[PDB]
Amino acid sequence: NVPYTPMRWAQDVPNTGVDKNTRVMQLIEAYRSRGHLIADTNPLSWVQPGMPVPDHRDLDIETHNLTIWDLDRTFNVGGFGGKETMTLREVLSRLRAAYTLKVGSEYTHILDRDERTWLQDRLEAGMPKPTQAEQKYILQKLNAAEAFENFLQTKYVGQKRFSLEGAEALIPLMDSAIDTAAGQGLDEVVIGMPHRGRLNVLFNIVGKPLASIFNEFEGQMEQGQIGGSGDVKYHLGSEGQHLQMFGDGEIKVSLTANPSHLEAVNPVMEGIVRAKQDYLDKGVDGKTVVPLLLHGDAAFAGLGIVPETINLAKLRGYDVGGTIHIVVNNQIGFTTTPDSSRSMHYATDYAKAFGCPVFHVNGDDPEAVVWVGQLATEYRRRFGKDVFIDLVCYRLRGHNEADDPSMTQPKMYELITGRETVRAQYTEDLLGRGDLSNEDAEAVVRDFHDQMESVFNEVKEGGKKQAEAQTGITGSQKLPHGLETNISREELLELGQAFANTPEGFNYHPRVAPVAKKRVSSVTEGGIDWAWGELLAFGSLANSGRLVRLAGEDSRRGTFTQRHAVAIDPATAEEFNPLHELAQSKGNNGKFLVYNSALTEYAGMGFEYGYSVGNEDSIVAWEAQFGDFANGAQTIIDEYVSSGEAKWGQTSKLILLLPHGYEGQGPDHSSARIERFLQLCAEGSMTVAQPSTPANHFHLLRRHALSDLKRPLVIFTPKSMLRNKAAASAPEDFTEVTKFQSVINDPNVADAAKVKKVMLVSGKLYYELAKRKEKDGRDDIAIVRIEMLHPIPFNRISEALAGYPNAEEVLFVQDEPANQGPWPFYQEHLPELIPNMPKMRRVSRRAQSSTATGVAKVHQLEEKQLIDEAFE
Amino acid sequence: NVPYTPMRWAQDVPNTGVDKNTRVMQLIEAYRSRGHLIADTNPLSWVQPGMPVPDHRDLDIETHNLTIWDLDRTFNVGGFGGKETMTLREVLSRLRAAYTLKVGSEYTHILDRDERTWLQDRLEAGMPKPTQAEQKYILQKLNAAEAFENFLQTKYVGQKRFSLEGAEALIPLMDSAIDTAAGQGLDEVVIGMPHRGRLNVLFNIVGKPLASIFNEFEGQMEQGQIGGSGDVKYHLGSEGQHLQMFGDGEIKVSLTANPSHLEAVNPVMEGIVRAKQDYLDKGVDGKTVVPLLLHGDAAFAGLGIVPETINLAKLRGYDVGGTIHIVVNNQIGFTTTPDSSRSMHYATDYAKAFGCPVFHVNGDDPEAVVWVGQLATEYRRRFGKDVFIDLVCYRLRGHNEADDPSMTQPKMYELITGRETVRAQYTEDLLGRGDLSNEDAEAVVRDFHDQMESVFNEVKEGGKKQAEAQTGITGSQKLPHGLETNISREELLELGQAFANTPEGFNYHPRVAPVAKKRVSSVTEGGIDWAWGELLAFGSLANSGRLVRLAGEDSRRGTFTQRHAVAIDPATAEEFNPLHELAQSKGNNGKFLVYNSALTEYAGMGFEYGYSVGNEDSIVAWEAQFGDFANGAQTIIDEYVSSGEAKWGQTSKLILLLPHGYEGQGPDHSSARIERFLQLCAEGSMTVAQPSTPANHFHLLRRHALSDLKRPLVIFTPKSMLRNKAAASAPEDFTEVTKFQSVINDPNVADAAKVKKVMLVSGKLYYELAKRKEKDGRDDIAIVRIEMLHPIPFNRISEALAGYPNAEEVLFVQDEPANQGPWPFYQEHLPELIPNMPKMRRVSRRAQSSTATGVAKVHQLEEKQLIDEAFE
Ligand SMILES: CC(=O)SCCNC(=O)CCNC(=O)[C@H](O)C(C)(C)COP(=O)(O)OP(=O)(O)OC[C@H]1O[C@@H](n2cnc3c(N)ncnc32)[C@H](O)[C@@H]1OP(=O)(O)O
Ligand SMILES: CC(=O)SCCNC(=O)CCNC(=O)[C@H](O)C(C)(C)COP(=O)(O)OP(=O)(O)OC[C@H]1O[C@@H](n2cnc3c(N)ncnc32)[C@H](O)[C@@H]1OP(=O)(O)O
Ligand SMILES: Cc1ncc(C[n+]2csc(CCOP(=O)(O)OP(=O)(O)O)c2C)c(N)n1
Ligand SMILES: Cc1ncc(C[n+]2csc(CCOP(=O)(O)OP(=O)(O)O)c2C)c(N)n1
Ligand SMILES: [Mg+2]
Ligand SMILES: [Mg+2]
């Protein structure tokens, strides 16, 4: 059992052509670059049958024209090993000790010279010898891991737990990293992980009490929100503290909630870290909250969310100082082996796309694992980049504890069954080298078992409760009754002037200058448009002292060239952000931050959801280029935004701004899918709205920000109505009207006793119906608008209908096809809530498999047909 | 304007320590590895202000301790340039000519030695000098590209076209690749691409007639399906032929349809290629259909679907022999620059994760572009791997033709406005070197303009039609009236015996052997379960002579250990596929292929959709591990499966198998989201079903395969009912019952005149209600099952209800919450279709924000409450 190729027999060759010193330097370069291909990193003696084996002929001395006859000759090596001269025997010895034992390293692809040199120097010095106290501490942690697993196996046989047996070195690796961070003087560590070994990490790394875990297994579950539905035990989070064992440091440790969908926690935990860093406010030399992210081998290579999230690492609004990644490589999926899972040689090969180092380590050598953890945390602090660790290990049982893995992998489980564990091997090694006594070794086991037995007995004394029905979360948070959302006239004029107070030699571009002038004049003369209404809301909130963040694709300028939140000078390329300047000059330390995202919907929306969880007092908004591209983030909408409160008691106030409207631009630029969002709503989980005037959009945003109802808000924003002059607002609507309106009654009814038809509408189709009513002179019609879709404002609709006592018909008019839009939701729910209302009649486009037509002339013909049908 | 650093002044150094020959070899290695960092590949003199600049100190002779005083000394170079000895002046000259001009190359990261050597030899030989005929052919193609763009600009000013101006070298690059493939003797080329330059590619590469394109712009659109909705002009496909200009070869060229969602065509076009290759059947040395895939720079770096699809390249059921990728790098998104779009240095850096070569080429040197196209197509044919081309160019106008790019990028558009085009520059170069006359150069322009003017005038003679309403696609395909789907008794016994005809020294695993015995005995005694029903269907179809493909996560064994389509011997690890063996021994050349996918839902489902489009006569099925993970493929469901026929006239017969059932395993293992699928249905777009017996599943699958209705099928499959003994089927149900049943009436009604309540149910909740009816002895109840959900079988439901003439109530009973499951769809539609039916009453779980509870005791309490409510 020796892992190297034997030395071969050959004749001595002459020193002609390429010199032999050149050949020895080429050998040094080969080991530094490709020596990981023959390193002892696998605990099993296993080669997977269907995977390609890379060529490694570069690592034998024959390929470089050297022979056994050169081993005692001396050569110039140019500073290798801190020496100018050396023998080929000593060169080979050093190379093999550094690059072919229990740690394999990839770092030669890095472009910067100082980075490469730092890693090279530390890997060739070697791992320093640990003290006896340190060695005993590693043994305590290994014991805890294995003992906990065995206890659960014995007391709860059938129950699913997802064990860590085979990979118990993870616990001392994570401990090493957290301890190193505490010594650097940092503030917090945030963890995200999957199912494999979660209950072990909660107890041994985070510090969740043992009583809690035992209760979970007996069927008593901790309640997150009053009347909540809940979730399985391996999807929950917790908080704790970690004290340094051989030091005076202390750090905080947190673990985040997640669903079963793998790798969906990656963008969410990055956002939590960024929000925490921003609150501490320590600058570029800060970055004092560390992200620690765990993966599995099949998931890391397969799912596309992983590289999509790593691509945000060095961008302006997303940087968090680097991420430490750990891949638990146990050489198996569920019933699938690596030959069917990836087309890369290693699972961690995405690192080479981003220019980052990789360390592969044997999971049956605990002292090497502790060294790699320390080295990774030091690299992050110095260079501010991502680092990847590959922990090679195995899975002792099946995928779960009810499965038989021999049916599909017979030969692999001949090697696994009946091995000795990593705790047993390490105890034998320490007693052999005389580093531990037998009394000590036996105490370590006895003490921990007594602790667990004690707690278990205490938990069984208390009787088990019986099942009870779950009520719901509708009334678990209060509504802001009697809150006023208007600003003063002085405040409005100051916001307007921000666009006139340009810096010293700044000028606007000629096509942007008219927009700025209109903003300064409109706050006294009238004609405020949609974009200016939105910015007035965010600006007012930043003045009071809040952090406002807006992110999305092309969101600084606007997709429809409407926003201009940051302006650029054509002559010098200088930038200007008016509303941020005004906020910083009022002495409440408010901020307005606008960022242009990368081209992603899954990672984008996930990052903003996380920001809202990490700072409860911030105002965060994500914008989509068109609302039709939000189906690329369906996982986040379904698993986090719509359902997080009911499952885990985790609350959010994220704002989604989704453009919507039927204007003839085709099926992928027409519908944000209102029907889908209204399906997900129940128990008052989120607010859904489609306003028709800038002032009403202003009041909606301010009500959300100043209330104490911590639930999301989904708004459907316009595209063509952005520049419609019938939709503009007057200053009195921002300063004298006090509240947001959920139903707007018709403002052009002469006599209410002559009305015989009521139309209900939502959005931009109002302005067409109104136009036609004026032209034809109809005094028997009244058009009523619905601005808030969920919850249903049934008291207001009832009040409006009651104001027309001679009405015989009610029509519901929409632009969307009959199987889309708000009609399906309203035809089900509204008749129950208003019993005395006449039967409703739909007027819409016909039902369709697609969203809209692709021909523009057909669009115009349909619109004419629709409006004609409404007016008899 | 010289691009190199000047030679510096220094003293001569002594030849001590590391020898100077060693230093010259290190310089050669540096240029081969990192010389692309200083190559002349950018047409503009532009450096983006916020992007990091890599260190390239390795490429100057000072860092290797050499000086101007060494330039005329001679050194040993070890075969470089086919010489044993050389001067430092000649070495530098050759390195700079090979690695620093108009082509930059990355290939040193490749692990195989023979690959590296092949590339190295071809890049150092250089580009061969082209003939005069070849040169004139390149000028014709450049002219065509630019001329077409200018014509459309002039005749249709406001209209959106997404121009290729700035990147006209794409047309000769694509032409070079297709021409090289025709010379190799291959069969077809399949293209997928986005919006940028689509109408140009349709006319100049594929061969779509010019009349068609002009008509599109005048508002006359070609119809795909009778009564279809349509789509915008830059989303359509076409077919054509390509004849070799200087050869006797011929090849077929195809372009595929796609939506606006970027990069969603990547898995779909890979599947089309695989299906075409399988039909030709030429073996491992075949692979004679070439995939050619075009991208943009922002999309390639940002979206996660790109690397997810490249990861399928070398897997067993997905390999297509390599893909040629072209990235059109025009240094801008919409209003976003590379500093805000990626954290990689180049957009094509994913190549280094997969071990593939990259070529960067200047888009203003057309002869170099034609060489790189040829070299890439040769590499694919020899090594069977992916290859990446980065075409560096610019965008002359805005994102569309209505946008002003100076508002956000002032300095970049000072360099662009008023340049001379690539056609103009090339004409000037050829007239300078005397390779073309002026008469020739003027004819090239005049002839092409005359051609276009002719066609345009002909198109305007015919009058323009007026708009007309679109009818729908419901009746555009026929239903299979009077088709019988039963097999003979002889056929059933033969299928059973397949599991007894093991190979010579094969034995089953002890936990798989009982399943095999039961399969052999059940075809004569009874008790056929769900999995065996499914396999009997697929086997029967493979016997008749069809290619059957089944793919999904853990689909060979089954997620619930139920299928066992391939078995493994514990002693030798040999594999056995019974139903494939039987099919190949009947002389119709049928196949049963089962594959275990990688861990992806977006790329998985997309690949199977593509397979169904590329071979209309195959039976393809995709399976999900649980139906709750299908929201990861929402883009494919919404943009291709649900809506492809109505938009493009593209038909498919894909089968989705989605597990579903409420059994207490929590919110991410309970619901496949039936309500979402029933929203997407209209105009008879697809079939949705939830059967309750194995025999009925058999008949459904066979009806779909033998009919002429080319639409998808979505089935909701069980989890616990897989092993329920009340649900098993008898042999007569496969051989004497002729058709699939859409409604199954109650089989335990003694007297029909005593019934006073009818319950409607779908799925596994039948077996609980039936149980309770027997126990309590209720003869006033009748339970009726609905097996097909869409379309609604309203004639059968009416017939069933009419059979109970004294009924007073109808109850609709489901397990799902009230805002989920089939109730929302049925409460809207069924009362209209059956006017005389009593008012329906819902019995279900309460409405919820999440899918299901996380506590198991609460699940059991809810189920009891539900069944009690049903029975008064
Ligand atoms: C979904 C969420 O975010 S929380 C909703 C929780 N409650 C429910 O779902 C209960 C069922 N729903 C209902 O009874 C009704 O739909 C109501 C009461 C919410 C609204 O019906 P109406 O009375 O017709 O609506 P109206 O617009 O007059 O609202 C009444 C008050 O509720 C407030 N309100 C209503 N919806 C919201 C909301 N989403 N956020 C904040 N305040 C709200 C209004 O500001 C108003 O306050 P006021 O006292 O200052 O006038
Ligand atoms: C959705 C698709 O893929 S095709 C939809 C095309 N048709 C429509 O949408 C019309 C509207 N729908 C209807 O009129 C009704 O729902 C029907 C006629 C389709 C079915 O209603 P019922 O008559 O109650 O159902 P029933 O099960 O008896 O079907 C009658 C016949 O249609 C056939 N059929 C019904 N649905 C399908 C289907 N999805 N695929 C194949 N055949 C079908 C049955 O096999 C049967 O044929 P038979 O005469 O040989 O026995
Ligand atoms: C998005 C998604 N797809 C599929 C699944 C189903 N699933 C659960 S575990 C698993 C295997 C995971 O393998 P690996 O990442 O190696 O984890 P290990 O069990 O080895 O820790 C799969 C496919 C899932 N939970 N989420
Ligand atoms: C999935 C998706 N997200 C967003 C968009 C909106 N969008 C259309 S074009 C575009 C810019 C694409 O940039 P690039 O890939 O460089 O294309 P180019 O315009 O340079 O050809 C964006 C974000 C889209 N069509 N699809
Ligand atoms: Mg694994
Ligand atoms: Mg671009």
Author numbering:
A (entry chain B), B (entry chain A): 349 to 1220
Task: Give me lines lifted from the publication on this model.
Contrary to most organisms in which three enzymes compose the 2-oxoglutarate dehydrogenase complex (ODH), actinobacteria rely on a two-in-one protein (OdhA) in which both the oxidative decarboxylation and succinyl transferase steps are carried out by the same polypeptide. Here we describe high-resolution cryo-EM and crystallographic snapshots of representative enzymes from Mycobacterium smegmatis and Corynebacterium glutamicum, showing that OdhA is an 800-kDa homohexamer that assembles into a three-blade propeller shape. The obligate trimeric and dimeric states of the acyltransferase and dehydrogenase domains, respectively, are critical for maintaining the overall assembly, where both domains interact via subtle readjustments of their interfaces. Schematic illustration of the reaction steps involved in the oxidative decarboxylation of 2-oxoglutarate with generation of succinyl-CoA and NADH/H+ (ODH reaction), with emphasis on the catalytic steps catalyzed by OdhA. These include the ThDP-dependent decarboxylation of the 2-oxoglutarate substrate followed the reductive acylation of the lipoyl group provided by E2p (both catalyzed by the OdhA E1o domain), and the transfer of the succinyl moiety to the CoASH acceptor (catalyzed by the OdhA E2o domain).
The same grid preparation strategy was then applied to other full-length OdhA samples, i.e. enzyme without added ligands, or preincubated with either CoASH or succinyl-CoA, leading to maps at comparable resolutions of 2.1-2.2 Å. In all cases, the maps, which showed well-defined density for most side chains, allowed to trace the OdhA polypeptide chain unambiguously starting from residue Pro102, corresponding to the N-terminal boundary of the E2o domain, with excellent stereochemical parameters. In contrast, the full N-terminal OdhA segment, corresponding to the first hundred residues that include a predicted helical hairpin analogous to the one observed in the crystal structure of MsKGD, could not be traced due to the lack of supporting density, confirming its high mobility in solution. The E1o active site at the dimer interface showed a clear density for ThDP-Mg2+ in all cases. In contrast to the crystallographic structure of OdhAΔ97 which fits the resting state, all our models refined on single particle EM maps adopt an activated conformational state of the E1o domain, even in the absence of added ligands. The state is indeed revealed by the shifts in the loops 566-579 as well as 809-836, that could be traced in the EM structures but were mostly unstructured in the OdhAΔ97 crystal structure. The presence of a bound acetyl-CoA activator, most likely acquired following heterologous overexpression of the enzyme in E. coli, may therefore explain the observed OdhA activated conformation through a mechanism that involves the stabilization of the loop 809-836 in its extended form, promoting, in turn, the activated conformation.
